[PDB]
Structure 1
Amino acid sequence: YEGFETLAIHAGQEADAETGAVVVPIYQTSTYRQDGVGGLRGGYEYSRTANPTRTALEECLAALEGGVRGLAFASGMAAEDTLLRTIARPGDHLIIPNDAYGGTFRLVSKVFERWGVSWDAVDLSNPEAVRTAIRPETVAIWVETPTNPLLNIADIAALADIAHAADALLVVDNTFASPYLQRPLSLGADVVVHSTTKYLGGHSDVVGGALVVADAELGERLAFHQNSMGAVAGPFDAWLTLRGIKTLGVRMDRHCANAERVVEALVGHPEVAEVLYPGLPDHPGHKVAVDQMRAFGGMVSFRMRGGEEAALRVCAKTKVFTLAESLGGVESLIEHPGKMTHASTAGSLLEVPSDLVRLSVGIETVDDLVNDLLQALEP
């Protein structure tokens, strides 16, 4: 019955057996001495196959999402690539979101399509659209919720029942919510994907990815690709991600509180046409978010009345929010998806409005963040 914040510090992380070291060592090693041929020590043989620091991260992530197996990768994108290489083959079909991380769209449309996988982008906020989009060849439904960058909401349990009726897998990219806010496996998801670059590492200082699964056999198929394709998290990056995880609860509590205050400053600001945040009662899918999320996240998007020109000006004018790609760090970030993170979706069903600004609201003192936005919004 251990609580989330306890598991984040302790799961996978018993003190070292030989020395008692209370923090997992950094096993910066490629290989391991065997006691006679095949006489493994502690089950280790070669670091791409398994590394003890990476094991601690994988076990911690599995505990936090309530899965049987975690797997850590060199980036979120590498987690996605290993997942799709494992579960798809030429001739298969994928349903993907109609609003998603540009890199997900690029991997599916520009690499996997060349390799014989078909796809359709669907409004995942409409179960009847997802049900209808199933094809005989569909192997998976790929869900982000909240979506990047509009923060639209998908009912994970509802979509799990649709996927499973079609003998398809439900994949949830839980990057934005993190395990602290949302636990897709508990609602029927088969696979959880993270970019640990974002909230799990939490400090804008590690690029990494992860998968967590409910089914041990699927976990073994994914681990075979983790080993054979080799897109693994290195031990030092894994160690920093695990260090970050230890404060996910306290960071996420502050991201959510600071984002609620930022939303209050944006709603009704005369320069702001629309505020996108799952916690607003009139946000599409608010009631689903209330069902499935502990709180509504640190991300806030909004549209400028004066269009792209006004949005580009706001993005250049902040002095506390930093203009950069990425999200989920302690530090506040701002960007223009149209020209930055989502320029890769221009011309597709996933194209983002040119008047949109995306915020990753950090854990700085909230009055500093509100004041910085208010001066940046002033024409």
Structure 2
Amino acid sequence: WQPGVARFETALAGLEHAEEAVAFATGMAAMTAALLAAVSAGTPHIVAVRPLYGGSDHLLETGLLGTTVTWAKEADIASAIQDDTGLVIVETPANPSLDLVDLDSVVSAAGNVPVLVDNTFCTPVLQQPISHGAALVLHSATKYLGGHGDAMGGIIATNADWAMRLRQVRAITGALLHPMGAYLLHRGLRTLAVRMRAAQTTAGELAERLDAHPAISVVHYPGLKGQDPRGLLGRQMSGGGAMIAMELAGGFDAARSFVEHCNLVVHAVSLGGADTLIQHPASLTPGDGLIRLSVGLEHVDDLADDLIAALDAS
């Protein structure tokens, strides 16, 4: 019953072109409510597509909320669907491999089963899952939506029935967004358009410079030459996005050495802000010689000068 939460909810619902949106304390609380809404509806089975986000897959794997998950590849989602399947969870691009998922194909495979798309790294600026047929669109507002991640958040833009169902869970589960945090998110939402466009354009140029260096074997980025065999860019995505994932030829040995030599680019577990970030998945808990990268609002030449110098370690 807060005003700051309502203004942020309708702002994101309009951005995603959804009927309404429901805001929660964190991204985890939004996923929890969506899962609990399916369980309460007498439909606790979830067909989740892998790759999926680190914290989100713990929720399904443990099955704390009384959920049963059957991991299925994108190509065969329909086969995994059971009579009690209530949701089809899918993250695009497939974090942290950055593989593109055809949302139109996923929705047709699900049929009468609602599809939940994690549009966290894409943002409504670079992807509209609702338009492809996704019933629900999940967000972890901390990354990109807020811009700085100082205020945590989680929101699902969906149709009226699923939104009412989510609000009912929120009512007794109590995972509410604080008005101060919602205010910071709605403030950052005004500049989302210019931030994602600038971060995507600097990421595209950065992706070209990374593959040219012999220190890394290849770098994953949808916008790169031949890294979109499906033709999903333009049809589904605005561009290549602001996420770069690269594989080092030196393996785990060169990965940790490359991270410590970076001065401008810093290391963090949560990624997706105004500052450029890197995260070694092997050095946190994925590939051993794999390094993740979230592109910020810095000058492309300043980032390239720092990454190339750190790669020169070998």
Q: Are 2:302 and 1:375 aligned?
A: no
**Aligned counterparts of 1:115 and 1:70: Cα–Cα separation in 2:** 22
Structure 1 equivalent of residue 299 of structure 2: 365
Please report the TM-score for the alignment, with normalisation by the length of structure 1. 0.79
1:318, CA displacement in angstroms?
1.0
Q: Are 2:101 and 1:154 aligned?
A: yes
1:73, CA displacement in angstroms?
1.0
What amino acid is aligned across from residue 86 of structure 2 in structure 1?
A: V
**Aligned counterparts of 1:307 and 1:59: Cα–Cα separation in 2:** 46
Q: Are 2:121 and 1:176 aligned?
A: yes
**Aligned counterparts of 1:148 and 1:284: Cα–Cα separation in 2:** 16
Q: Are 2:273 and 1:329 aligned?
A: yes
Equivalent positions of 1:291-310 (< 5 A) are: 291-310=235-254
Structure 1 equivalent of residue 27 of structure 2: 76
| Greater mean alpha carbon deviation, residues 90-99 or residues 63-72 | 90-99
What amino acid is aligned across from residue 122 of structure 1 in structure 2?
A: A
Residue from 297, 300, 318 that aligns with 2:262: 318
Please report the TM-score for the alignment, with normalisation by the length of structure 2. 0.95
Residue from 171, 194, 203 that aligns with 1:227: 171
Q: Are 2:153 and 1:201 aligned?
A: no
Change (3 A) 1:209 1:285: farther
**Aligned counterparts of 2:103 and 2:205: Cα–Cα separation in 1:** 28
**Aligned counterparts of 2:113 and 2:152: Cα–Cα separation in 1:** 30
Check conservation: 1:199, 1:248, Cα contact below 8 A: yes
Change (3 A) 1:103 1:364: same
Structure 2 equivalent of residue 34 of structure 1: none
Check conservation: 1:92, 1:118, Cα contact below 8 A: yes
Query: Which portions of structure 1, spanning 4 or more consecutive aligned residues, are displaced by more than 6 angstroms?
Result: none
Residue from 48, 72, 82 that aligns with 1:122: 72
> SS at the partner of 1:326?
coil
**Aligned counterparts of 2:237 and 2:65: Cα–Cα separation in 1:** 36
Q: Deviations over 1:236-262 (max 9, x none)?
A: 110001111111111011111110111
Equivalent positions of 1:46-125 (< 5 A) are: 50-89=1-40, 92-110=44-62, 113-124=63-74
Residue from 134, 137, 140 that aligns with 2:84: 137
**Aligned counterparts of 2:230 and 2:275: Cα–Cα separation in 1:** 27
Check conservation: 2:35, 2:65, Cα contact below 8 A: no
Change (3 A) 1:335 1:100: same
> SS at the partner of 1:362?
coil
1:353, CA displacement in angstroms?
0.9
What is the number of residues matched between the two proteins?
Answer: 312
Q: Deviations over 1:244-299 (max 9, x none)?
A: 11111110111111101110111131111121111123225551233201112110
CA RMSD of aligned residues (A): 1.5
Equivalent positions of 1:186-265 (< 5 A) are: 186-214=131-159, 216-265=160-209
Check conservation: 2:242, 2:294, Cα contact below 8 A: yes
Q: Which residues of structure 2 form unaligned runs of 5+? A: none
Check conservation: 2:141, 2:154, Cα contact below 8 A: yes
What amino acid is aligned across from residue 72 of structure 1 in structure 2?
A: A
**Structure with the greater alpha carbon radius of gyration:** 1
What amino acid is aligned across from residue 226 of structure 2 in structure 1?
A: D
What amino acid is aligned across from residue 130 of structure 1 in structure 2?
A: I
Q: Deviations over 1:27-68 (max 9, x none)?
A: xxxxxxxxxxxxxxxxxxxxxxx2001100001011111111
Q: Sequence identity of aligned pairs in percent?
A: 37
